[PDB]
RNA sequence: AGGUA
């Protein structure tokens, strides 16, 4: 009966295999981190590393010995901080679903500091994590050894994870709120302040827009240069006037050289995003991929805010 | 802070190898007896290995040939 | 009492075009304070110089094709709105730009005056093929405060003119872009401070450190009487 | 539920339209405001830890 | 809450968390902690049947480490009849049932972080100190009789800091009201200490320092770490038979 | 940093000394299941190549 | 180029309720103004507020006395709300000193020379028994923002009195701010807004020295941008 | 045992 275990054998896989520099907590949105970093409560932070500010303290001389280290980490004094603030630096830490069906259920983000107790999460991860923000725990794993940093940063990296395995369409897609704030900015109404202008550049349609001299979604004409990757591997510069709207120019802002404008120049749902940042990837690479969909995230937020969609009882 | 190893891979095609490879620089790195080769910003030895490959300066070659090198002025 | 003042503002600029500028630390919420109110100053009301009012010697329509010119006329007029003109003399100044020959028709065609700076030496203004081989207007650049669009302006002008003065949305603002961004920062173990980054693409008219400080100068002018 | 908020001199849609905080600029369309009434569960951040 | 069913008012009253008068009568006395009501003259037995007291639960330790208190709602000189609430239980006012608290809400994105599901809340809510729950948590420490030797609870612990001997008594209980914080030492409990293994660096030291092995080790009840708070109510346990200390 | 006790403390040991690797040893958990399965009227070694 | 606003009348319909305006403003500038001055009131206004109470009878919060029909943590709750003024003194102890049955409010409290209470009516507490007596040292010191006893308790660590009980203070004097940008018409300059500010304040602070202050902070942060280090 | 995903 003690080897005969379900699932699997006990001590060994499950249950358990209790693992050591492990913490766990609930997890809110991180709407301002980059992909490929995650919030870490302080205290976890201070908690889970209490081995590397001990041999920081050492190093720089600060405590004769572990005890006297011990003794100023639980003052907590802020001559620690700093040094936690270096170990975090450069270390990546393991996140970790409570279910596991996938090999997205675990993902490295680097951690930042924060104040406060619960983990934030960047919100494009958490479709990978299939995690919603009401109440669902996840654990957070050190990698000590030097190659198991190593091994975090190049395997188990989001920014290196942006396609399912399963299929190779990505999985960080924007899902919800960004979709419905890139809808919004996209979707051209019949008639709105500013429409028959002639603009070059979105830089002027995102003045106009800030200003309040134009509405966000209304047809104008836009000189705009887009870049089409063509002969070797070479960008085309090819700068003609389109007919579009405000927020479809102000989102070509975003868009990285080399794609097509008529990716842009439409209704976006979330088919619509998930095949554009696909094209993304395709034709640009990985760099470009993550820096445009942390990019359309944050555009996204900031006008789905500015939309004020919110569901009435006469709606 | 390396945000993607995707210019690692381009010079280690395996993806595999690429980590043992720069975990011996870095382990080189950390552990007494070598001296940097691209200056940091406070960093420790991971994002270092990851930019020393990057560059070209690193990989199997240059760890294995340099091993020798320092392997004969020991022994002299 | 005791109040927190930003220190070590850092710069990196491109050009005299594009800069980001980030300030720290600053206290919860004067990121956000500090960002709208520069934008809104920068972007609603700066003063400036910019074209209004163009000629066409062939057709007086604004949507109309050009004889002898490969670019139509709504185009053309659109290209003059990125044209970046700096005047230091009186507020409404004419500029004759006349020139003949193929080729393209940039800002360094039109004459310089002892009043006009060209910021743009090089800029495309328009296009000229065979058939006319010749293209020739007067343009008004005058001093103004913020963006006026064409569409605007006719509305606040009753005083009617002959058709061939084509209205053009002028830029009076020097900046083509401005965005704030606030992150969070951290000083001592305190961490409710804030960067404030100010992403800025100006037009060469002024540099953006100038534009901002300039800025700033403004909104402190408008400040003082409240203050004893 | 209408003719009670036409009573207490309010938007008989329930919804009011919103300046932000940040930019202090109204939000387009209105947005639905009122008191609910929330609870706090014994799920704790603190103890979660 | 503002938008009811009904049922708060039955489910409060039902419930025994509310102090409801049995008898009805004029209040006579009102107190945090005891309500005295002055029966009415045709709901009194005959003879002196007197006054009807309500002593008032007051920070008690649920099942769910959260506090349980009962405020007056009423107050001197006001008639109440049978079934009237007198006092007010926890999540309960006025005699309606009253988890949670009404907030205004506004439904709307606002730059991420309301995402999935999750809540945006401003300061306000903490500064007005509104759903701030008052969490009274349990400790136990037991002086148990050891073969070593029988435990006991003094102020004088061996090698601690004084900041630990001065928030004991004499007695070595910390003081009812004192504020403590993880790690902070509550009973000054010690276990007489057994035979000792000393490795030769520990021979060494001791040699040099003069220093020798404490015959008793401390074991004093600490704060766990990560939490805080006030000792509001301390309980001493001695069975009978057993010499009393001056705490108890 | 789950079963090799000798694994845990050297790399305790490594980590305040500054220095990151690791000795992959064997997990107790591993020993208990040999012994256990050994209880049994059941052999089961190590054997080296 | 500008026309400069200009303080003009400043109305009280109510002793907490004052309407600022700003009549010469440039179109354009109404909601930066605004909304600059809105944030700078909730944000970084200096007010007068209670941090420590030191209640003889009692030796924590969560106690109670005699003849009080309130909790001591309902004292202190009430307390928080308490609006005062103090102009000498950065940090002052009032003492309260009560007996006898009947609703001790904030008028009760000792005033000094300095000490101005704003809202004598504010009720602290019910005494319902003959001989019940509360005094009570009531600490109000000066600050901005919000700081909540669980702050400067980690920086005092443990405060060696335990007969005294901090409470979080809401150093924030006032409570609502709005503002109504209007055409303001004028016969200079055809193009003009008036800026209507409608505070809530606890009646601490004047909204004159409101907006006075709320300038000051919003140069000294414009400091920075005039003058840049490179 | 109850509760959470």
Redesign the interface.
Same mark, same amino acid.
């Given at each position: 009966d003690m080897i005969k275990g379900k699932q699997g054998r006990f001590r060994q896989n499950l249950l358990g295999k209790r693992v050591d520099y492990s913490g766990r907590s609930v997890i809110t949105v991180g709407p301002y981190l980059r992909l490929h970093q995650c919030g870490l409560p302080k205290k976890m932070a201070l908690e889970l590393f209490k081995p590397f500010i001990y041999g920081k303290l050492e190093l720089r001389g600060l405590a004769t010995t572990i005890k006297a280290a011990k003794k100023m980490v639980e003052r907590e004094e802020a001559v620690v901080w700093d040094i936690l603030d270096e170990v975090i630096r450069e270390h990546p830490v393991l996140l970790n679903r409570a279910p596991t069906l996938h090999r997205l259920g675990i993902q490295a983000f680097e951690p930042v500091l924060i104040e406060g107790k619960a983990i934030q999460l960047h919100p494009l991860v958490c479709a990978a994590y299939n995690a919603d923000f009401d109440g669902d725990q996840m654990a957070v794993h050190v990698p000590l050894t030097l190659e198991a940093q190593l091994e975090a940063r190049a395997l188990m990296m989001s920014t290196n994870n942006i396609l399912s395995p399963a299929n190779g369409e990505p999985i960080i897609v924007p899902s919800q709120d960004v979709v419905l704030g890139l809808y919004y900015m996209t979707r051209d109404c019949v008639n709105a302040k500013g429409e028959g202008m002639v603009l070059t550049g979105p830089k002027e349609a995102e003045r106009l827009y800030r200003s309040g001299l134009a509405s966000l979604h209304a047809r104008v004409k836009v000189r705009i240069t887009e870049y089409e990757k063509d002969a070797n591997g070479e960008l085309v510069a090819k700068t003609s006037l389109k007919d579009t709207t405000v927020g479809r120019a102000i989102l070509w802002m975003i868009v990285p050289k080399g794609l097509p404008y008529s990716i842009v120049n439409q209704a976006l749902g979330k088919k619509a995003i998930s095949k554009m940042l696909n094209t993304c990837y395709r034709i640009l690479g990985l760099k470009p991929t993550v820096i445009f969909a942390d990019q359309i995230m944050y555009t996204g937020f900031a006008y789905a805010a500015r939309s004020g969609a919110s569901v009435g009882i006469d709606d | 802070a390396r945000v993607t190893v995707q210019d690692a891979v381009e010079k280690i095609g395996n993806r595999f190898d690429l980590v043992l490879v720069a975990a011996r620089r870095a382990r080189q790195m950390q552990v007494g007896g070598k001296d940097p080769l691209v200056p940091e910003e406070n960093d420790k030895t991971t994002v270092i290995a990851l930019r020393e490959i990057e560059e070209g300066l690193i990989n199997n070659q240059i760890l294995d040939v340099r091993e020798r090198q320092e392997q004969q002025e020991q022994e002299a | 009492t005791e109040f927190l003042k930003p220190r070590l503002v850092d710069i990196e600029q491109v050009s005299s075009t594009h800069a980001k500028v980030t300030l720290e630390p600053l206290e919860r919420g004067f990121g956000h304070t500090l960002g709208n109110a520069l934008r809104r100053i920068l972007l609603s009301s700066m003063p400036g110089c910019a074209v209004t009012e163009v000629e066409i010697d062939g057709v007086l329509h604004e949507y109309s094709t050009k004889e002898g010119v490969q670019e139509d006329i709504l185009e053309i007029l659109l290209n003059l709105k990125g044209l970046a003109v700096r005047v230091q003399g009186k507020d409404e100044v004419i500029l004759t730009l006349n020139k003949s020959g193929i080729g393209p028709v940039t800002a360094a065609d039109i004459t310089h005056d002892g009043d006009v700076e060209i910021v743009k030496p090089q800029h495309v203004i328009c296009h000229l093929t065979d058939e006319n081989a010749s293209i020739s207007m007067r343009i008004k650049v005058q001093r103004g405060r913020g963006y006026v669009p064409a569409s605007t302006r006719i509305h606040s002008e009753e005083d009617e003119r002959p058709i061939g003065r084509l209205l053009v949305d002028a830029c009076y603002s020097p900046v083509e872009r401005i965005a704030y961004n606030v992150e969070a920062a951290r000083v001592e173990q305190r961490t409710d401070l804030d960067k404030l980054v100010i992403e800025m693409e100006t037009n060469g008219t002024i540099d953006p450190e100038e534009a901002i400080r300039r800025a700033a100068t403004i909104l402190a002018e408008q400040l003082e009487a409240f203050v004893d | 539920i209408k003719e009670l908020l036409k009573l207490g001199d309010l938007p008989t849609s329930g919804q009011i339209r919103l300046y932000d905080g940040r930019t202090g600029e109204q939000f387009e369309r209105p947005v639905t405001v009122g008191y609910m009434y929330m609870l706090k569960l014994n799920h704790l951040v603190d103890d979660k830890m | 809450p503002l938008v009811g069913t009904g049922m708060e008012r039955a489910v409060a009253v039902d419930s025994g968390v509310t102090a409801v008068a049995k008898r009805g009568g004029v209040v006579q006395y009102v107190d945090a902690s005891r309500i005295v009501i002055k029966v009415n003259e045709d709901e009194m037995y005959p003879g002196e049947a007197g006054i009807d007291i309500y002593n008032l639960t007051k920070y008690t330790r649920s099942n769910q480490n959260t506090c349980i208190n009962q405020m007056p709602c009423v107050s001197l000189g006001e008639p109440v009849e049978r079934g009237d609430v007198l006092a007010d239980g926890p999540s309960t006012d006025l005699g309606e049932l009253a988890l949670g608290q009404n907030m205004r809400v506004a439904f709307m994105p606002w730059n991420g972080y309301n995402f999935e599901d999750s809540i945006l809340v401003s300061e306000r809510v903490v500064q007005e100190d509104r759903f701030t729950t008052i969490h009274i948590q349990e400790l136990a420490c037991v002086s148990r009789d050891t073969k070593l030797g029988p435990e006991e609870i003094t102020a004088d612990i061996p090698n601690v800091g004084e900041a630990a001997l001065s928030k004991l008594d004499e007695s070595g209980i910390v003081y009812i009201g004192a504020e403590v914080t993880g790690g902070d030492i509550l009973v000054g409990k010690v276990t007489p200490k057994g035979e000792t293994q000393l490795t030769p660096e520990e021979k060494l030291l001791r040699a040099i320092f003069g220093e020798k092995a404490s015959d008793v080790k401390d074991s004093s009840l600490r704060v766990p770490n990560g939490v805080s708070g006030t000792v509001i109510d301390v309980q001493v346990f001695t069975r009978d038979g057993v010499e009393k200390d001056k705490r108890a | 940093?789950? &079963?090799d006790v000798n694994g845990?403390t050297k $790399?305790?040991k490594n =980590?305040? &000394?500054?220095?990151?690797? $690791?000795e992959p040893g064997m997990?107790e958990?591993?020993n208990?299941?040999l012994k256990? =399965?050994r209880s049994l009227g059941i052999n089961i070694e190590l054997e080296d190549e």
């Amino acid at each position: 009966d003690m080897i005969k275990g379900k699932q699997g054998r006990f001590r060994q896989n499950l249950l358990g295999k209790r693992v050591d520099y492990s913490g766990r907590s609930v997890i809110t949105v991180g709407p301002y981190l980059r992909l490929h970093q995650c919030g870490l409560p302080k205290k976890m932070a201070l908690e889970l590393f209490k081995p590397f500010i001990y041999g920081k303290l050492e190093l720089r001389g600060l405590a004769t010995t572990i005890k006297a280290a011990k003794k100023m980490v639980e003052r907590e004094e802020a001559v620690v901080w700093d040094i936690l603030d270096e170990v975090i630096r450069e270390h990546p830490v393991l996140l970790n679903r409570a279910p596991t069906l996938h090999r997205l259920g675990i993902q490295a983000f680097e951690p930042v500091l924060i104040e406060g107790k619960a983990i934030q999460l960047h919100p494009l991860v958490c479709a990978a994590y299939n995690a919603d923000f009401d109440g669902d725990q996840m654990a957070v794993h050190v990698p000590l050894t030097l190659e198991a940093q190593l091994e975090a940063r190049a395997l188990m990296m989001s920014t290196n994870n942006i396609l399912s395995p399963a299929n190779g369409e990505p999985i960080i897609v924007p899902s919800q709120d960004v979709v419905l704030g890139l809808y919004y900015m996209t979707r051209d109404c019949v008639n709105a302040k500013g429409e028959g202008m002639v603009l070059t550049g979105p830089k002027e349609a995102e003045r106009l827009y800030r200003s309040g001299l134009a509405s966000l979604h209304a047809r104008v004409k836009v000189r705009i240069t887009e870049y089409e990757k063509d002969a070797n591997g070479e960008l085309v510069a090819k700068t003609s006037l389109k007919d579009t709207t405000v927020g479809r120019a102000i989102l070509w802002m975003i868009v990285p050289k080399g794609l097509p404008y008529s990716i842009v120049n439409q209704a976006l749902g979330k088919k619509a995003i998930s095949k554009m940042l696909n094209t993304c990837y395709r034709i640009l690479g990985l760099k470009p991929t993550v820096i445009f969909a942390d990019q359309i995230m944050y555009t996204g937020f900031a006008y789905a805010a500015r939309s004020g969609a919110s569901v009435g009882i006469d709606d | 802070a390396r945000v993607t190893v995707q210019d690692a891979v381009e010079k280690i095609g395996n993806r595999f190898d690429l980590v043992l490879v720069a975990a011996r620089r870095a382990r080189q790195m950390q552990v007494g007896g070598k001296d940097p080769l691209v200056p940091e910003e406070n960093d420790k030895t991971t994002v270092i290995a990851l930019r020393e490959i990057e560059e070209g300066l690193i990989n199997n070659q240059i760890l294995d040939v340099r091993e020798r090198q320092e392997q004969q002025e020991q022994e002299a | 009492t005791e109040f927190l003042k930003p220190r070590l503002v850092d710069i990196e600029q491109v050009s005299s075009t594009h800069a980001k500028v980030t300030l720290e630390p600053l206290e919860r919420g004067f990121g956000h304070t500090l960002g709208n109110a520069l934008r809104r100053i920068l972007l609603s009301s700066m003063p400036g110089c910019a074209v209004t009012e163009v000629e066409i010697d062939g057709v007086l329509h604004e949507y109309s094709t050009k004889e002898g010119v490969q670019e139509d006329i709504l185009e053309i007029l659109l290209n003059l709105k990125g044209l970046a003109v700096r005047v230091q003399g009186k507020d409404e100044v004419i500029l004759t730009l006349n020139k003949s020959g193929i080729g393209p028709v940039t800002a360094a065609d039109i004459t310089h005056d002892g009043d006009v700076e060209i910021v743009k030496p090089q800029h495309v203004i328009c296009h000229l093929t065979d058939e006319n081989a010749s293209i020739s207007m007067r343009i008004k650049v005058q001093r103004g405060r913020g963006y006026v669009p064409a569409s605007t302006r006719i509305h606040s002008e009753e005083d009617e003119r002959p058709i061939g003065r084509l209205l053009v949305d002028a830029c009076y603002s020097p900046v083509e872009r401005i965005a704030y961004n606030v992150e969070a920062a951290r000083v001592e173990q305190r961490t409710d401070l804030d960067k404030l980054v100010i992403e800025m693409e100006t037009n060469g008219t002024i540099d953006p450190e100038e534009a901002i400080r300039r800025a700033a100068t403004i909104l402190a002018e408008q400040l003082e009487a409240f203050v004893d | 539920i209408k003719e009670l908020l036409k009573l207490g001199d309010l938007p008989t849609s329930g919804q009011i339209r919103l300046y932000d905080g940040r930019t202090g600029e109204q939000f387009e369309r209105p947005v639905t405001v009122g008191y609910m009434y929330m609870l706090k569960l014994n799920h704790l951040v603190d103890d979660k830890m | 809450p503002l938008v009811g069913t009904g049922m708060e008012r039955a489910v409060a009253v039902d419930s025994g968390v509310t102090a409801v008068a049995k008898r009805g009568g004029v209040v006579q006395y009102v107190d945090a902690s005891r309500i005295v009501i002055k029966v009415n003259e045709d709901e009194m037995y005959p003879g002196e049947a007197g006054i009807d007291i309500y002593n008032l639960t007051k920070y008690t330790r649920s099942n769910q480490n959260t506090c349980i208190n009962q405020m007056p709602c009423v107050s001197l000189g006001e008639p109440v009849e049978r079934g009237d609430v007198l006092a007010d239980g926890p999540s309960t006012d006025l005699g309606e049932l009253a988890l949670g608290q009404n907030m205004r809400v506004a439904f709307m994105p606002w730059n991420g972080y309301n995402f999935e599901d999750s809540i945006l809340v401003s300061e306000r809510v903490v500064q007005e100190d509104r759903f701030t729950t008052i969490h009274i948590q349990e400790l136990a420490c037991v002086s148990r009789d050891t073969k070593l030797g029988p435990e006991e609870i003094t102020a004088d612990i061996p090698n601690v800091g004084e900041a630990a001997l001065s928030k004991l008594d004499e007695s070595g209980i910390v003081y009812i009201g004192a504020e403590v914080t993880g790690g902070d030492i509550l009973v000054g409990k010690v276990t007489p200490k057994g035979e000792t293994q000393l490795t030769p660096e520990e021979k060494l030291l001791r040699a040099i320092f003069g220093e020798k092995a404490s015959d008793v080790k401390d074991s004093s009840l600490r704060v766990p770490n990560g939490v805080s708070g006030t000792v509001i109510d301390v309980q001493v346990f001695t069975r009978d038979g057993v010499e009393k200390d001056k705490r108890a | 940093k789950s &079963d090799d006790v000798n694994g845990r403390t050297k $790399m305790y040991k490594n =980590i305040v &000394d500054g220095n990151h690797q $690791m000795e992959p040893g064997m997990p107790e958990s591993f020993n208990v299941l040999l012994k256990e =399965i050994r209880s049994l009227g059941i052999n089961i070694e190590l054997e080296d190549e």
